[PDB]
RNA sequence: GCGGAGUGAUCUACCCAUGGCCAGGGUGAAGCGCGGGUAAGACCGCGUGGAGGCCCGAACCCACUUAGGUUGAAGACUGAG
RNA sequence: CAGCUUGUUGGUGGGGUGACGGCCUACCAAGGCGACGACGGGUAGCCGGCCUGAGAGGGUGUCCGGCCACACUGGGACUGA
RNA sequence: GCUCGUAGGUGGUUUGUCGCGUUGUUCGUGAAAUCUCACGGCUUAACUGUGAGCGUGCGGGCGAUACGGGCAGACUAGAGUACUGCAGGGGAGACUGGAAUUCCUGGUGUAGCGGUGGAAUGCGCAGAUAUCAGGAGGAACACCGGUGGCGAAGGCGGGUCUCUGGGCAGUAACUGACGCUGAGGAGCGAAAGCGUGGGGAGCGAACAGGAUUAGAUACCCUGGUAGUCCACGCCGUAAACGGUGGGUACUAGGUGUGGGUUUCCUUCCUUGGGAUCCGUGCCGUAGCUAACGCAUUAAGUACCCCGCCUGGGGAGUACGGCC
RNA sequence: UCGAAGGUGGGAUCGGCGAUUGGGACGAAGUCGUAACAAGGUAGCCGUACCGGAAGGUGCGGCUGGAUC
């Protein structure tokens, strides 16, 4: 079940990218 | 730098825990009563009384001149 | 590139004794010739990366050789540098 | 106010041709040289250069604020910016 | 924490010191340190030792003893070996 | 991700010297106390005292040169050059070929076409689909084609020409350790993406409709924008994988396949048999492995250098900084 | 002249708080789905891009840590 180790990383990276896309503007570009 | 010479010393010593032989150098100052010296100049030196802030050495004899 | 009769005309002029072809000086000479012609090849065909890498390989080889000659004897280093061109 | 026929671009708006004018300071673009860097470059440092609806500022052209004028010196100006 | 250094690096003539010494000063040159970590930030008195460990190591520097620094905080001289 | 390369680390064979490392001995120092050994006394002990070690290190002198290091040399075995050959989708530029898809023009011709698990949206009846001819354009290059070849990796094939890189073999002509690796650094780096300008057939994120469904922001269908293509920059990431860093030496074989060289029936042609160099696969011994398996292309036996790990999450995230 | 303290100033740097806001972890018998594990019902993952309440979906390239002949 080595793919599980990839899925956890995938979900964490996906949520981080989703947060960055939620804030690619003065929400975060100012900061 | 006007009757001052810089000799780059050499020393090898046993590394305290890993036991290797480390090659460590120096850069130190020695006197020249005559300001003639090229670049290279395997030469020998001995200590003196300080003649400047970081002067502690004197050139004694110059061998195998810079070629 | 660098046919036999093209390499001989700098083998006589740069190699030592009528048959020297592997000395430091000879190798610098024909590496320099190769780099010159390949830099022409790269002034045309700006984006031939696989040959430009070959150029950098020759450049590295020649750099090792020039440091070799500068350590082994310095007067021949000076002469070769003046009669080829450095820096 | 409406119509017909004329008059006007010597004001003003724009344009066209041909001339003229813009004290004095300042900044220091491209380019061009020299040097460093490496194989060669990039690139960098110095000079040089003198760009720009560039800067400060007279003339000149405006007209932002303000005070005065308001049967004015003047049917739109003056003083100070 | 990647550039730090102008009395900084050196020399000369001086001054000054118990004494060499940019320790200080006038002049001259532009050098010295650094990736073997300069400069900086944080932490810390250091040591023979003590604790632990089979040792190497790791932790620590309390009694004793040695060295250093300080004496409310900060700056300076005097006498006197 | 890969390579090159800076500092550094490390370095083949041999001659002579120095003796820095290394190593031998002595002298001095390494205070006292502490720790260890032996005694002695506090009633024993804790504690103390005395003598002997410890004080690993350092400085001077006198020895040595086996190894490492410096120096002055030498050799060709590593490395590189030359010469003769060799294979290849290695790269770049220009021109160019045909199939096929789409569209347009016309000829024929009529009521369907398309699509699905089944449909519908949709296309057509204004002449679609189909079929014939011509033309425009873009992209990719069937068969060769492979398990193969080449490239450092990423990657690379329609053809021709031009320029160009690397690799392999053989001769021993040449240099004579010039090597290996490589912190940093630099370059290259699939696809997606970004900028500018072109191009745009087909495909196709987004989007829209249809369908399915409880819903269907999907899978399926119908269209379809970016993009995919080109030029030049930027990006610098991939399960960039052999999840296996580079170099070198050695350690049964068996069997394919790719590129050379060389000896025997040599003209019995057989283009068989053997040896060797370099690849590239499979299977397997020793050995290794937690096992899976690896196994001369090692994950074996060793050496050199680099990168990286120290339980899982938090997190390759925050903060800072660089791009 | 030098000179501590003090004053003025602009920076550097290390912290605290901060309306508001963002994710993380741990909790409970909550709500919406069912994305992965079997061909997990559309093989799954990697990078990247876009989209979506949410897991996710899709495109392009890649891998087998999937299949088929
Ligand atoms: Mg299992
Ligand atoms: Mg002096
Ligand atoms: Mg009228
Ligand atoms: Mg008129
Ligand atoms: Mg007029
Ligand atoms: Mg007129
Ligand atoms: Mg001017
Ligand atoms: Mg200029
Ligand atoms: Mg102006
Ligand atoms: Mg005038
Ligand atoms: Mg006027
Ligand atoms: Mg006006
Ligand atoms: Mg008024
Ligand atoms: Mg005025
Ligand atoms: Mg001075
Ligand atoms: Mg002086
Ligand atoms: Mg004096
Ligand atoms: Mg303290
Ligand atoms: Mg232990
Ligand atoms: Mg103490
Ligand atoms: Mg105390
Ligand atoms: Mg007190
Ligand atoms: Mg006194
Ligand atoms: Mg290499
Ligand atoms: Mg390298
Ligand atoms: Mg090196
Ligand atoms: Mg060495
Ligand atoms: Mg050796
Ligand atoms: Mg007794
Ligand atoms: Mg006793
Ligand atoms: Mg005792
Ligand atoms: Mg003692
Ligand atoms: Mg050889
Ligand atoms: Mg080619
Ligand atoms: Mg056609
Ligand atoms: Mg069309
Ligand atoms: Mg028709
Ligand atoms: Mg038709
Ligand atoms: Mg020779
Ligand atoms: Mg690196
Ligand atoms: Mg690149
Ligand atoms: Mg692309
Ligand atoms: Mg684009
Ligand atoms: Mg965009
Ligand atoms: Mg465009
Ligand atoms: Mg679709
Ligand atoms: Mg839809
Ligand atoms: Mg092109
Ligand atoms: Mg990565
Ligand atoms: Mg790949
Ligand atoms: Mg990896
Ligand atoms: Mg290896
Ligand atoms: Mg093989
Ligand atoms: Mg096997
Ligand atoms: Mg293993
Ligand atoms: Mg942890
Ligand atoms: Mg990040
Ligand atoms: Mg940041
Ligand atoms: Mg708050
Ligand atoms: Mg599911
Ligand atoms: Mg899925
Ligand atoms: Mg389903
Ligand atoms: Mg699925
Ligand atoms: Mg994806
Ligand atoms: Mg979608
Ligand atoms: Mg795909």
């Amino acid at each position: 079940g080595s793919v599980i180790k990839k899925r956890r990383k995938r979900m964490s990276k996906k949520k981080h990218r989703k947060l960055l896309r939620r804030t690619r503007v003065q929400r975060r570009k100012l900061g | 730098m006007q009757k001052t010479i810089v000799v780059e010393l050499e020393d090898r010593m046993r590394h305290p825990l890993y036991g290797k032989i480390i090659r460590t150098t120096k850069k130190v100052k020695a006197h020249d009563e005559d300001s003639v010296a090229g670049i290279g100049d395997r030469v020998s030196l001995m200590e003196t009384r300080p003649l400047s802030a970081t002067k502690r050495w004197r050139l004694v004899e110059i061998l195998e001149k810079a070629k | 590139a660098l046919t036999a009769e093209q390499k001989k005309e700098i083998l006589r002029s740069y190699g030592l004794h009528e048959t020297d072809t592997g000395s430091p000086e000879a190798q610098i000479a024909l590496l320099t010739k190769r780099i010159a012609d390949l830099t022409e090849h790269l002034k045309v065909h700006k984006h031939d990366h696989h040959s430009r890498r070959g150029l950098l390989l020759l450049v590295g080889r020649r750099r090792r050789l020039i440091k070799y000659i500068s350590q082994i004897d310095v007067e021949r280093y000076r002469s070769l540098i003046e009669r080829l061109g450095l820096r």
Side-chain angles (χ1 to χ4, degrees), chain B:
Chain B
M1 82 319 302
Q2 326 159 93
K3 315 183 334 163
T4 302
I5 203 68
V6 57
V7 59
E8 315 59 24
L9 197 60
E10 190 29 47
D11 162 356
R12 63 189 68 248
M13 86 106 63
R14 158 83 66 54
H15 174 117
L17 164 151
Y18 299 109
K20 252 184 100 163
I21 298 333
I22 321 311
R23 272 264 334 289
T24 37
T25 89
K26 295 222 181 83
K27 285 169 94 286
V28 293
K29 309 331 175 44
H31 317 162
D32 289 332
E33 69 272 13
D34 44 353
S35 68
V36 84
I39 307 302
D41 318 67
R42 204 70 220 152
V43 311
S44 178
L45 68 139
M46 338 171 194
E47 57 105 17
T48 57
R49 43 155 281 260
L51 293 178
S52 79
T54 166
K55 205 88 180 183
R56 304 294 184 271
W57 291 157
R58 71 176 176 89
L59 172 60
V60 174
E61 52 90 18
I62 300 170
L63 53 92
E64 58 185 358
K65 205 47 162 163
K67 186 256 184 65

Side-chain angles (χ1 to χ4, degrees), chain C residues 1-4 7-8 11 16-17 19-24 26-27 30 34 37-38 41 44-58 60-61 63-65 67-68 72 76:
Chain C
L2 270 77
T3 63
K7 316 166 100 173
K8 311 308 138 283
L11 290 174
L16 297 179
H17 53 283
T19 192
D20 155 35
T21 206
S23 85
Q27 282 162 24
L30 53 159
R34 278 193 83 191
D37 90 357
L38 193 55
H41 181 72
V44 50
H45 313 103
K46 253 95 172 73
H47 287 294
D48 169 7
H49 304 147
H50 286 84
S51 299
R52 173 191 342 280
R53 179 177 180 267
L55 186 88
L56 283 317
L57 290 174
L58 316 197
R61 186 97 29 71
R63 207 185 298 91
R64 325 161 100 71
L65 293 170
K67 95 160 45 189
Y68 176 52
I72 58 170
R76 81 194 281 190

